[PDB]
Amino acid sequence: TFFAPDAVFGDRVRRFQEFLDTFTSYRDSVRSIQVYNSNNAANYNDDQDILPHRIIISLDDLREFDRSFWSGILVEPAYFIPPAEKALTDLADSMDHPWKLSFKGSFGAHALSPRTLTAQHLNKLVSVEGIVTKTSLVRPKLIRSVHYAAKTGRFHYRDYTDATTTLTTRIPTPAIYPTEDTEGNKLTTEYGYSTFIDHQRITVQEMPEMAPAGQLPRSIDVILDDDLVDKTKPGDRVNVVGVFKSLGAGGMNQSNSNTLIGFKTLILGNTVYPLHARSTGVAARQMLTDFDIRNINKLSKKKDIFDILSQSLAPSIYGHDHIKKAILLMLMGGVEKNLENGSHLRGDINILMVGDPSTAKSQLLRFVLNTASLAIATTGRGSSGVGLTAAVTTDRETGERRLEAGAMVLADRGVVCIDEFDKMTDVDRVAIHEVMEQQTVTIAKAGIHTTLNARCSVIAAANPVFGQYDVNRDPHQNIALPDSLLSRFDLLFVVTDDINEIRDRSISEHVLRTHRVTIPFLRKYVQYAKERVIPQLTQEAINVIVKNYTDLRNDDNTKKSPITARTLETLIRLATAHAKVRLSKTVNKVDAKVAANLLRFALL
Amino acid sequence: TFFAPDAVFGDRVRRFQEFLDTFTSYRDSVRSIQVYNSNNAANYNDDQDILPHRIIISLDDLREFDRSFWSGILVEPAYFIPPAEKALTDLADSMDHPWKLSFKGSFGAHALSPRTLTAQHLNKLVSVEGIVTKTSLVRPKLIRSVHYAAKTGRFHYRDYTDATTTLTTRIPTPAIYPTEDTEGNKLTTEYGYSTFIDHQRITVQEMPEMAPAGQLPRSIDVILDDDLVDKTKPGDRVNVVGVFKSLGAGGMNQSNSNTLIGFKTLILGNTVYPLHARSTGVAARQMLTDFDIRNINKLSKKKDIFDILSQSLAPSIYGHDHIKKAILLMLMGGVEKNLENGSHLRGDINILMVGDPSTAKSQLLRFVLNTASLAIATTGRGSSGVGLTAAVTTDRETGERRLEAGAMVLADRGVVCIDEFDKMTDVDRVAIHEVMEQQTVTIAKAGIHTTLNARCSVIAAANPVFGQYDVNRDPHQNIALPDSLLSRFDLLFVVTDDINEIRDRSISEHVLRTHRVTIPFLRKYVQYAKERVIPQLTQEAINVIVKNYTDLRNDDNTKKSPITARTLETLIRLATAHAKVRLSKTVNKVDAKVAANLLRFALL
Amino acid sequence: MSAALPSIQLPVDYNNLFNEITDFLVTFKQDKGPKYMAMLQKVANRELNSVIIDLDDILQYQNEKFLQGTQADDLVSAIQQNANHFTELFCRAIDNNMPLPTKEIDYKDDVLDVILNQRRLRNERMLSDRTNEIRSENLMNDALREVVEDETELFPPNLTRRYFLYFKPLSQNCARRYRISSKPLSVRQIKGDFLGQLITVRGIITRVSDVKPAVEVIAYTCDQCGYEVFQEVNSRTFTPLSECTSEECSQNQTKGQLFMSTRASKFSAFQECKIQELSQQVPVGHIPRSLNIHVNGTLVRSLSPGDIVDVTGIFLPAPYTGFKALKAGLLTETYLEAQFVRQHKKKFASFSLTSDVEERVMELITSGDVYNRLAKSIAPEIYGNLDVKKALLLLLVGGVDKRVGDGMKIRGDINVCLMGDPGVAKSQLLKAICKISPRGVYTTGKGSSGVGLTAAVMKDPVTDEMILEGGALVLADNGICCIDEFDKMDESDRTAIHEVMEQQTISISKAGINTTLNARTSILAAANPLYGRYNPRLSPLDNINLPAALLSRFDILFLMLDIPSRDDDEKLAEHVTYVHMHNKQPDLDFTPVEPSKMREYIAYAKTKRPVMSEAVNDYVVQAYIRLRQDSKREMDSKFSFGQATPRTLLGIIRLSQALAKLRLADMVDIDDVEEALRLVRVSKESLYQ
DNA sequence: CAGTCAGTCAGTCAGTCAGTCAGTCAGTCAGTCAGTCAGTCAGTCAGTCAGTCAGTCAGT
Ligand SMILES: Nc1ncnc2c1ncn2[C@@H]1O[C@H](COP(=O)(O)OP(=O)(O)O)[C@@H](O)[C@H]1O
Ligand SMILES: Nc1ncnc2c1ncn2[C@@H]1O[C@H](COP(=O)(O)OP(=O)(O)O)[C@@H](O)[C@H]1O
């Protein structure tokens, strides 16, 4: 007997036992965790000769099970969480350790931002969201010691506790780190058998998209635990569900007190979820039921789907099919081939638009900013620290210099949507030269010489030099950002403003009826097209791009400028991407025809 | 987990488990206790619509089982008794609570009297014997409280401990007798559910038969426990086996100390045995195997056993058969018949010898003092307090007067052997008048008027008045203690000193060969003759003692003096006793013949 | 709160037991209307103070409800297990319903009534004032009642009570009829595992103390605020208190000062005594123990010293340990609360009823020849001596005292000696008649000292101080004091007995006493002759070690000879052997009267006071002329006994007045006085053979 | 010459009072202990200047 607990604790354990045996999915989840760790242990104990322990409980069911247990948890959680955890360890031990819970909700009008937190909400269960800054370092915490004795040869043992334990209180008893037992003998300690459990604390500010007009922000701080270390990098957007504990003696202990108001507050646990934002953080968690992949397989084998998905990104924009084809070929992105003992070769596609004003060149990039995943938009400026980190760190614990990522490091595997590309000064264009082929960013400022990684994809939309004169004088510097910047870009779409009468009609009823295939299927098509499967190139497609490339040199070197081997490499990239679209494995002549036609319309 | 005990405790528990399953009588004893309490519980739960828990372990077996466990107990018992008790509760719970032990020995050269006790024998296991004085009062001790709450209706609970608990030490935590829980509510206590366990302490002096010549005695004190309350009245002779604990902080706590030497000592537990003495305490524990009662049944049905057992009390005394017959008839003692709503009628026999010196009258009474049970000898004086208590009590705790029994109260169901009966003054002879028929002793001294009980049997041996003149002048006052004292006594054996020549021979070779049926069988015959069975008188024996009694009045009132109805009552008593001798149930004419002849030789 | 002072569930509920105890309190019809509206109405009519709630009506109610349907919750064992909570729970179950107004108050009634009446009336007017205030400040009416009932401080119902409440244990008869709560235990048997139950003991009461008031609640006045601040006291010692604790003299700057008063507190009588072990239920080698008793309330003054009693009560702890160095924590030192007291040997004259009693008495009266039958009945287990039993019945009756207005008092009582030795079975009669009569003390020769049978002075524990502890004679007054071996007494004891021969008086002038205590006793003695026995050569008073003054103080003197005679021996032998053969003597044609019914008869007989007449004047006078005339014509130290003092005349009128009561008649006649002269002339003068 | 009565010592019992031992206490005084403070020390943040680059004007 610990303290031979009361029949109240028996009442809570029996009732929650009845609920957990009422709905029977959770038993199957426990069975899945237990079998998976079992067979992993069989692989690690049989050939050569991980998953945590928590069950996600939703608060849907308890509202239709018991009002008492429902409104019991959301008011006083230090009386209702340790019984339910005790019964769940009873079930998991009986079917074949902590076994914590989650409480995914649906929360009870406790959806509050940390502006309105304190203080009559104290010691309840509260859900908080916001930005994460300024995440500290990971340190291990000690729980159990083990000592070897000399010379009698008996191990020993000791426990340790704290105030950030299970959620009740306890009359504290400190305990010296032992040495020289009775009778007097040296106790040489040991490691490897003495346990350790990790520990980390992060602080949370309220959202800037939700904040007031201009005021100072106000923030709280969260302690994490064993299986929650290192989920959220600083800069994310994070939902936290926990218990708003208030520990410490607030200066009422000793008289003539300083630290005028004590009772410092924090939040324990419990279930940090990262969530999707508009501009930072992955959204690849989107579900794929078997109905959905069965429908993808149903539409997967047609012969017009490139012309269906061409006209899918334009629900309300007239014309410009070939731009849409280029944007889908960007979102598929090609394949990445890293060599053995050399340098890798680049996979994606880079697109520049240029043309007259009022041509929906800025309306398009917001649409690519919505449908894709990890889009980051930079307009104008810029300096300092888009392509770099600027290294401004003043770490308080010790003299050390960290890095704070800009816009180029953070958008990895993503899309960067730059507007007004001519307004950039050349000093940042040095950094764009460093990104767009070298695929690395070397920073050796004060400092620490590093070489991190960033392999983004770039879309820009620049204005002409003077007027709308896109065809009048010559193509030779209507753009005027020479010359390597013209060569790094794959495609150069040149958009004009022709005047007609039929074009005025077709624009007219489109714009008029707009004031009065579907995309959340289309991105589920996209990610399944991306992870499976990479194609290989075959013999049927070499000679088309070889003959086509010698054609483009021997004649387009008589028409226009410039042509490098980078054109050949982008031919291979668009061939691979159009092979990815049809969910195939090999490469056909059809792909070389389509990419050939796109490069014809792009250049000529 | 209490403190999640070590593998050392596991080693002791496993080893003693192996010993207890090695020898298998103890399992059968546990089975006997458990079945007996079970069927008693069936009688108390079935018709209407006790035994303690300890096993006697002998130290014979552990010397041939383990030397380590043997010499482990007799050196440091605070490390070896709680594991063995834990394993025995494991066995008793597993087959179907404390379950303590005994350790009956055979002790290891720790057989020491409390003169030589202190102090290098401290904190070991020690066996002590001596006299018991000055036993205190029995008080109940509290262990567990139970409180009813108002108005929420939940019971509560609390524990208590002390320093006279199980034999280790423990970091002490006192605890207020609770009232007004959180939150503030009145806690009205209860009784009946709160447990209580008894407590009593006695002190032990060394033996006066073992003491030095003349010195002051030195004494220790013993604490007893639950199932050992009220075994030993003060005056007994007691073997104690226990643990010589030394509790208390000895004035080293606070400086400038008084009570110059602290560390008061005592003995815990464990197994108080009362043992036989020469003059106080019953010896009716003598064993009766089935071989023995089969032999009693074998010798039980002969026709000469009264003449065999006549000549059994005289291994070395010539003559005097009829005295021996009278002494066996005293040791059987007759039967006691208490009436309904009246006064009881006396059962035993009282014998006076009188005669010349050097007639083995004093040698005989030592032999009756050895063979019987509860013999107490008083020679001469006497006053004050043989027949009374003298009430000398100066009880320290409160003003109160207790009683301290003399020689007459203490010899209940026994034999009192008084020598030199003429030397008693008449003031004590008033008390002998009170004892020998009224069978009660009324004391109303200061005081408390009482009426206790004492129903002894008396043997005396008085001298003649002057010279050896037992036959010379007249029987009318050769004794001279008139006259009711002559009538209270049943038999008056008158022993002379006749001179002869054949008598000189028969005395001579007897005394000569003495310098160069068996009694420890005979007392086992006696006690089985006593408890089973009482006889009833029948029709065949009335007319013999009626005709014999009218004979003795009409003719012995012409020869001698005196004859009362008490002679008739003693005829009935000797008839019943001689019926008890032959292990019968009814009463035959043979008994009346034998008792008739004994009263003829006694009077004439 | 969890994790410190935890909880436990048990099967015992206190929810439906209250409802069931209400249903038991209202609907019980068995013993005009229901049983407890009559007795409880009798309580509220202020003519009664105690309430006896037995444990038989509850059990009969459970068998009745068990056979009607539905199941009844087991309540009797629930009382027997705990028995302390149920006085308060039961008594707040009573107080909801009470038939209040059934009689207007008398003027001359009491003071406790009028105090509780003013508390009740003031309580009502206080409760009506607040609902006369808030109701006029608006803004079904149960809510306004709940408003007013929690903003008004009141006298709690623990203080306006007027009565007490006592249980009563169940017989073996009712437990036998339907199939424990009262098995008669001994003081050795009370293990320390009965603390809280409801048990039953038996023993002899010794050292019962005085009755002195003990406090329960103490009532102060505040003099400035006007409140009445109470205080409860549970412990042995309390402490007075200071400035105030109200709600008006608190939260102010200037606190008042309070001082007590004694006409508004609540007192209770209090008396403690001790039970000694019965000395028949002891093992072979032991000594009687003891166990304390507190007594509260109406039950007081029913514990006389030197009795045999059956006290039933509950068994609580009370905190103490002895010397400080012997404590181990938390030793408790028990006592026994009292609830209901039942005596063996019921004492006359504490009885009134006659109607049911005549069903047993009129059987003896209609049995025919009551007097010689009762004379046969006292100690039947001996043979012979019908005249001695005949006289000793007249000892047990006694009477009749007489005040002559001076006031000098005459007795009123009989004093009897017994003589002869040794086998005439005289001790059997002394144990016998000192067992039939209530309040009868048997003391041997030596025995008691001089200070043992007079009183002595000793300091008294807790109640104080200096009470005269009584001796043997002060214990047994209005009774019979048997005495063995009268010759061996010390001479101071002789003068004590001679002072008892004059009425009422023992006088003491020792070191701390000047008192004259009272003793109305009767003395029976038993002296032995000079050694050896009965020489007709020797004169009377030669074989007697006592002066003839003491022979004159005894109005009746006997002597029991011992002469061998042929004819009686066979009857005596068949008598005695007929009881060792069996356990009952008489046959053909007689049954012995049981002693309880006999004590009911003699206890009934002492309420008569007969009146003499004029023909008996002539007959008594002429008979006294006869005895006076022939008694003084001898004047010798021969077998004649001179000189027939007038104490024989007063003793023979007194024996006539004693024999007249057993006819129950007030009809003193000539068979009366002729019977008395027969017992006088046959009484003595038996030494002729 | 033997019984007896009365005188006489002796042991034992009750009264007597002076030590004795346990429990309580208040005042004060001292022993330690904690709150005070002051000086140290590194970190950190705002002011300030120098260099370098984009804009703009004027010269050919
Ligand atoms: N082909 C078109 N169809 C529909 N709307 C168009 C089209 N071309 C331009 N627009 C309109 O032009 C506006 C956006 O102008 P845009 O060219 O994107 O900005 P900027 O030239 O500053 O980059 C939108 O409001 C949109 O209604
Ligand atoms: N009949 C006998 N047979 C043997 N020894 C005897 C006998 N009679 C007397 N004695 C001796 O007498 C001694 C005891 O003397 P005893 O008469 O008992 O003492 P007293 O007469 O002083 O009480 C013993 O040692 C014993 O040897």
Ligand SMILES: Nc1ncnc2c1ncn2[C@@H]1O[C@H](COP(=O)(O)OP(=O)(O)O)[C@@H](O)[C@H]1O
């Ligand atoms: N008539 C009788 N009936 C029965 N028993 C008698 C009778 N006469 C004498 N006895 C016996 O005589 C004994 C007398 O003894 P008891 O009365 O105790 O004292 P005491 O010897 O002084 O009279 C009794 O025990 C009794 O058994």
